[PDB]
Structure formats: structure tokens, C-alpha cells
Write a protein that holds these residues in place. Structure first.
Motif, mmCIF file in Angstrom:
data_model
loop_
_atom_site.group_PDB
_atom_site.id
_atom_site.type_symbol
_atom_site.label_atom_id
_atom_site.label_comp_id
_atom_site.label_asym_id
_atom_site.label_seq_id
_atom_site.Cartn_x
_atom_site.Cartn_y
_atom_site.Cartn_z
ATOM 1 N N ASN A 71 10.519 -4.074 1.990
ATOM 2 C CA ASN A 71 9.623 -3.241 2.778
ATOM 3 C C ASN A 71 8.986 -2.865 1.462
ATOM 4 O OD1 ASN A 71 7.764 -2.111 4.576
ATOM 5 N ND2 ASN A 71 9.322 -0.820 4.847
ATOM 6 N N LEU A 72 9.459 -2.526 0.270
ATOM 7 C CA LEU A 72 8.440 -1.195 -0.835
ATOM 8 C C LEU A 72 8.167 -2.409 -1.678
ATOM 9 C CD1 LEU A 72 11.277 1.520 -2.020
ATOM 10 C CD2 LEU A 72 8.960 1.648 -1.116
ATOM 11 N N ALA A 73 8.953 -3.561 -2.019
ATOM 12 C CA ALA A 73 8.170 -4.489 -2.451
ATOM 13 C C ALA A 73 6.755 -5.451 -2.049
ATOM 14 C CB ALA A 73 9.296 -6.060 -2.936
ATOM 15 N N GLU A 74 7.343 -5.679 -0.180
ATOM 16 C CA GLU A 74 5.965 -6.086 0.198
ATOM 17 C C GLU A 74 5.029 -4.820 0.070
ATOM 18 O OE1 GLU A 74 7.222 -7.102 4.271
ATOM 19 O OE2 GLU A 74 8.138 -8.752 3.620
ATOM 20 N N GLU A 75 5.166 -3.863 0.471
ATOM 21 C CA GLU A 75 4.007 -2.552 0.417
ATOM 22 C C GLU A 75 3.153 -2.615 -0.778
ATOM 23 O OE1 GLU A 75 6.419 0.636 1.632
ATOM 24 O OE2 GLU A 75 5.197 1.360 3.485
ATOM 25 N N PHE A 76 3.358 -2.542 -2.149
ATOM 26 C CA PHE A 76 3.305 -2.814 -3.141
ATOM 27 C C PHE A 76 2.655 -3.643 -3.499
ATOM 28 C CE2 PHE A 76 3.974 -4.387 -8.094
ATOM 29 C CZ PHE A 76 2.861 -3.451 -8.388
ATOM 30 N N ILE A 77 2.939 -4.884 -2.846
ATOM 31 C CA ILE A 77 2.655 -6.324 -3.689
ATOM 32 C C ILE A 77 1.346 -6.649 -2.731
ATOM 33 C CG2 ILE A 77 2.106 -9.017 -3.677
ATOM 34 C CD1 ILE A 77 5.286 -9.003 -4.005
ATOM 35 N N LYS A 78 1.026 -5.911 -1.284
ATOM 36 C CA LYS A 78 0.096 -5.930 -0.255
ATOM 37 C C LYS A 78 -0.753 -5.091 -0.455
ATOM 38 C CE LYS A 78 -0.893 -5.806 4.583
ATOM 39 N NZ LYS A 78 -1.218 -3.851 4.648
ATOM 40 N N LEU A 79 -0.386 -3.770 -1.263
ATOM 41 C CA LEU A 79 -1.482 -2.349 -1.727
ATOM 42 C C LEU A 79 -2.012 -3.141 -2.961
ATOM 43 C CD1 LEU A 79 0.017 0.568 0.421
ATOM 44 C CD2 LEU A 79 -1.909 -0.272 0.654
ATOM 45 N N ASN A 80 -1.754 -3.199 -3.815
ATOM 46 C CA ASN A 80 -1.516 -3.023 -5.825
ATOM 47 C C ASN A 80 -2.682 -5.255 -5.902
ATOM 48 O OD1 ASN A 80 -0.337 -1.372 -8.205
ATOM 49 N ND2 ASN A 80 0.713 -1.407 -6.083
ATOM 50 N N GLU A 119 7.749 -3.720 -11.499
ATOM 51 C CA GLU A 119 8.006 -2.715 -10.596
ATOM 52 C C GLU A 119 9.248 -3.377 -9.232
ATOM 53 O OE1 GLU A 119 6.297 0.073 -9.655
ATOM 54 O OE2 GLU A 119 7.656 0.811 -7.821
ATOM 55 N N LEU A 120 9.473 -5.058 -9.244
ATOM 56 C CA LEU A 120 10.585 -5.211 -8.304
ATOM 57 C C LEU A 120 11.689 -4.662 -8.947
ATOM 58 C CD1 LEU A 120 8.236 -6.443 -6.118
ATOM 59 C CD2 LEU A 120 9.227 -7.407 -5.750
ATOM 60 N N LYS A 121 11.922 -5.195 -10.192
ATOM 61 C CA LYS A 121 12.974 -4.702 -10.515
ATOM 62 C C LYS A 121 13.323 -3.216 -10.373
ATOM 63 C CE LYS A 121 13.698 -9.060 -13.406
ATOM 64 N NZ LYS A 121 13.868 -9.347 -14.946
ATOM 65 N N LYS A 122 12.680 -2.283 -10.520
ATOM 66 C CA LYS A 122 13.006 -0.740 -10.524
ATOM 67 C C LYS A 122 13.323 -0.314 -9.469
ATOM 68 C CE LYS A 122 9.448 2.667 -11.787
ATOM 69 N NZ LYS A 122 7.922 3.001 -11.309
ATOM 70 N N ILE A 123 12.373 -0.990 -8.560
ATOM 71 C CA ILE A 123 13.222 -1.014 -7.492
ATOM 72 C C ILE A 123 15.001 -1.310 -6.344
ATOM 73 C CG2 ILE A 123 12.868 -1.956 -4.493
ATOM 74 C CD1 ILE A 123 9.733 -2.726 -5.131
#
Ligand code: SF4
Ligand code: SF4
Ligand SMILES: [Cl-]
Ligand SMILES: [Cl-]
Lengths: 254, 254
Positions: free
Chosen positions: B188-197, B237-241
Motif C-alpha cells: 500500500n505504501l509502495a503504491e501510494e509513493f509511486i502514484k504520488l511522486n 524508498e521501497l527498500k526503506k519501507i
């Protein structure tokens, strides 16, 4: 400290000894073999594990035959059933079986020592390949004489030894047990396809992870595969080879 | 064959019945609920499994409250230990637990029937969600009256029902057991990050496979993530998640 001091330290060690060299073809394993042939009754032994392609073995044989280094290649049935399902200790088990064979050859030939092309720089990296090796009393003369990467290259140039392309182990592509001859072939064809059709000259890896192709590549090579027509061609051809899913590792090499 | 003939067939069925509707928020499950509220003593029941985010549940509640559809949401501890390690039959087990609850509500309320927004087009696809459902005698009135996708949209426009964004189940991202609340959050966070940034407005999926992020995307959206600076930012960022490896599925959607 001083290349002639190392070169002459090395010749003194090889004098009057029957040396079996763990010869692979690589710059380091080649240089140790050439110097040994010139100063001792030496045999360059290459153990064919099934991890290096026919072409890599042919290249190693053709290098020894070119530099008049006596060389014998031994094909081994290493990929078995107990050995095939290893994964984490396979770099130790592979190098343990190799050392086991070199020790047999030395004893059958009544030779004195067994040497390997382990350089001094090679001791500052986690290498379970030289853990298993130095258990079987294999002398690393380059490491003992503090030979750096550039020392090996410089002396090789002086001895008229050509520097070959770095052909690496293909069991490294296998990330999921077992390390099968077909599993490695799947990676090999995928690498050959991308490197030939899309011209990825530098670093390219097609890792196998439970029939999933993970494509690893360099940072400056990246641009060559970014058009959707190339991505479709790669995804399509790789699935034809045998893969379930074709993915690209977004961690590009520095 | 004829929308008014279906619209009036549907009203005749709902007359004098106590109907519990399997309400989710989606166009189809909403339209069936609205028509039922106007013609029968109807309760739109939403079972919160833990597969849809708070925002999706809030949207479903705010739609029913807007269209004066009586709605009650039930939070359930479904993600347990036996239920969490399912993977292949989870779309059946999830929809079996939902049907189990709706059947309880109907019996406690002494209601007559339970209906779901299964349209006619939904019967020509492998749906184990309506296998488990039609086992518990849940009537799909839209399917029985041959309602197509465009019939549901057209009638919805007439009844002043807004068409919402297709919020999909988030257990679908989980490709490796178990389906954990954290595992879904990672996707969910990974999707939200790529979709927003990176502004991936259309189809975007960040699948979880033993802590490996598999990014799936549309064909025309592709260009937005091809510069190495975006790839590095996503991988980082995804590895940080929490991911081990960030990979991109080269099978882009048509
Ligand atoms: S890198 Fe390959 S050839 Fe070298 S020890 Fe490991 S498995 Fe064996
Ligand atoms: S798609 Fe998600 S919500 Fe629907 S039945 Fe399958 S697991 Fe349950
Ligand atoms: Cl090696
Ligand atoms: Cl669903």
C-alpha cells in the motif's frame, strides 16, 4: 614491497618442486601457472564442475596450449542430487570437491605441492571458495608475496600474457535450489539474448529465482532497454526460454 | 432484453421482502442497494475483513449515507493464524466468512433474503468469490436479470449514483503466504509513493513476494519511470519501507 623482489621470491619457491596449479583460465590463475612452467615440472589442472560453459573451458585450454603450460582438464559429475540441493554452502562444496580432486592428482603423480592464484587483494573479501581450499593445505603464493590486482596485470603484460574477458561462475545466477544444468542454461540463454540483441556489453545478469528471471544491469547500460518494444521482446523471448515471470532489478550497478 | 423490462422485473422481486444486501461501495454493489432501499425494508451490510483500507470503508459508508441507504459496517478479526496462511483458496475463504456473517445477520433480524451485486458479465470469469457465495444461497439478481456492465452504468446515471474509483482488494498484492496486515501495508505504501511522486494515475501494482516488490504497470504509463533518477528513488524508498529487492515486471498491461 617491490615487484622484482616478489618475482624473484616466487622463482626461489618454485625451484626443484613438482607443482600442481589450480588453473582456471583467469588472469591470476594463468600468471601463477606460466611462471611455474618456466621454473618447475608443473601441471595446470582444470576441474570442470559443470558451472562453466564449454566455451570457457575451451578458452582455458587454448590459453595453456598457447603459453606452453602443460594442462589437463577433468570433467566431473558434481551436479548430483545431494550436491544439487545446496544453495548457501555451494561455493564451499564446489571448492571442497575441487581441492579433493587436486589432492588426489598430486598423490597419484607423487608431486610436492598444490598452488592457487589467490592474490593478496582476494584475502580482504568473504571468500568461502578459499575457506574450503586452505583447509586442504593449498598454498596461495601470490597472497603470501602480497601481489595486488595491478601487480598481477603488470607482470602479465611483461610475460606477454593476454588479459581475457572475466568469465564468471554460472551457478551464481541460481538463487533458488536446486542448481540444475537446465536452470543455469535458462539464465545463460537469457543473458546471451539480451547481450546480443540489445548490446549490453558491460555487466549483465539474469538470475533464476523459482523460474523468475531477475535482470541486473549497469547504470550507463540502462538506456538500451528502456523502449517498450525492447521490454516486450525481452519479456516474450525470456518466457519462451522457460521463465514464469520476467522482472528487472531496479538496483543498477554504480 | 430491455432495460425498463429488467428495472421493473427487479422491482417486482424486491416488493414485500426484507433484503440484506452485500454492500461494498462498488458501482454494482451500490446500484443493487439503492434500488432495494426504495422498494423494500433493506440493510446494506459491509463486512470489514481487513483487506480494504480505512479510506475505502469510509467511502462506502459515505456513499450509503449520501444515497440514504441504511448501512451497517462490521469489523471482523479475519486475519488470524489459520486464515492468514491460505494464499490459493483465500478468495473463497474470505467470501465464505463474509457469507457466514450475512447469513447470521439475516437470521438475527428475521429477514427474508440476501442479495449481492453479481452482474451477468461476472459469470463468464473464474470467480471463487461467487463460488463460496452461491453455496450459502445468496441471490445475484443482476445476473439473474442479465444486467451487463454498461446496463449497470446507464441505470446508475439515471438514478443519480456517482461512479467511484475502482478500489480493489489489497490481499491480491500478497503473492507469498502469509497475508499479513504489515505485508499489505508494505504494498500500500509502495503504491501510494509511486502514484504520488511519479504520477502513475492508471493501473499500478506493487506485489509482495517473500519481501520482494514486483512493480506492475500500464503500457502508456511506462515512460514516467524510465529515468535512472526515478528508478533509484523508487528502489531506495521501497527498500526503506521494508522490501529486500525492488523489481519491475516487464509484462506491461495492454
Ligand atoms: S563461485 Fe561458482 S565455481 Fe566458484 S566456488 Fe562458488 S559455485 Fe564454485
Ligand atoms: S478478491 Fe480480496 S476481498 Fe475479494 S474474495 Fe478475494 S481476498 Fe476476499
Ligand atoms: Cl570462483
Ligand atoms: Cl472482490
Amino acid at each position: 614491497k617491490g615487484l622484482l623482489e616478489k618475482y624473484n621470491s616466487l622463482l626461489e619457491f618454485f625451484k626443484n618442486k613438482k607443482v600442481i596449479v589450480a588453473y582456471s583460465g583467469g588472469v591470476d590463475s594463468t600468471l601463477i601457472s606460466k611462471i611455474a612452467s618456466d621454473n618447475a615440472q608443473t601441471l595446470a589442472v582444470t576441474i570442470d564442475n559443470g558451472f562453466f560453459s564449454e566455451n570457457v573451458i575451451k578458452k582455458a585450454e587454448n590459453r595453456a596450449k598457447k603459453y606452453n603450460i602443460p594442462q589437463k582438464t577433468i570433467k566431473i559429475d558434481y551436479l548430483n542430487e545431494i550436491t544439487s540441493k545446496d544453495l548457501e554452502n555451494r561455493c564451499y562444496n564446489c571448492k571442497k570437491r575441487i581441492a579433493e580432486e587436486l589432492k588426489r592428482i598430486k598423490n597419484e603423480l607423487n608431486y610436492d605441492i598444490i598452488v592457487d592464484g589467490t592474490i593478496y587483494d582476494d584475502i580482504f573479501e568473504d571468500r568461502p571458495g578459499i575457506k574450503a581450499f586452505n583447509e586442504s593445505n593449498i598454498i596461495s603464493p601470490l597472497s603470501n608475496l602480497k601481489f595486488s590486482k595491478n601487480d598481477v596485470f603488470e607482470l602479465s603484460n611483461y610475460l606477454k600474457i593476454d588479459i581475457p574477458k572475466k568469465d564468471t561462475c554460472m551457478a551464481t545466477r541460481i538463487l533458488s535450489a536446486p542448481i540444475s544444468k537446465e536452470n543455469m542454461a535458462k539464465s545463460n540463454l537469457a543473458e546471451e539474448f539480451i547481450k546480443l540483441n540489445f548490446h549490453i556489453e558491460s555487466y549483465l545478469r539474469v538470475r533464476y529465482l523459482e523460474n523468475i528471471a531477475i535482470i541486473e544491469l549497469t547504470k550507463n547500460e540502462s538506456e538500451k532497454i528502456f523502449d517498450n518494444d525492447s521490454i516486450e521482446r525481452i519479456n516474450t523471448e525470456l518466457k519462451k526460454i522457460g521463465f514464469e515471470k520476467v522482472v528487472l532489478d531496479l538496483n543498477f550497478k554504480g
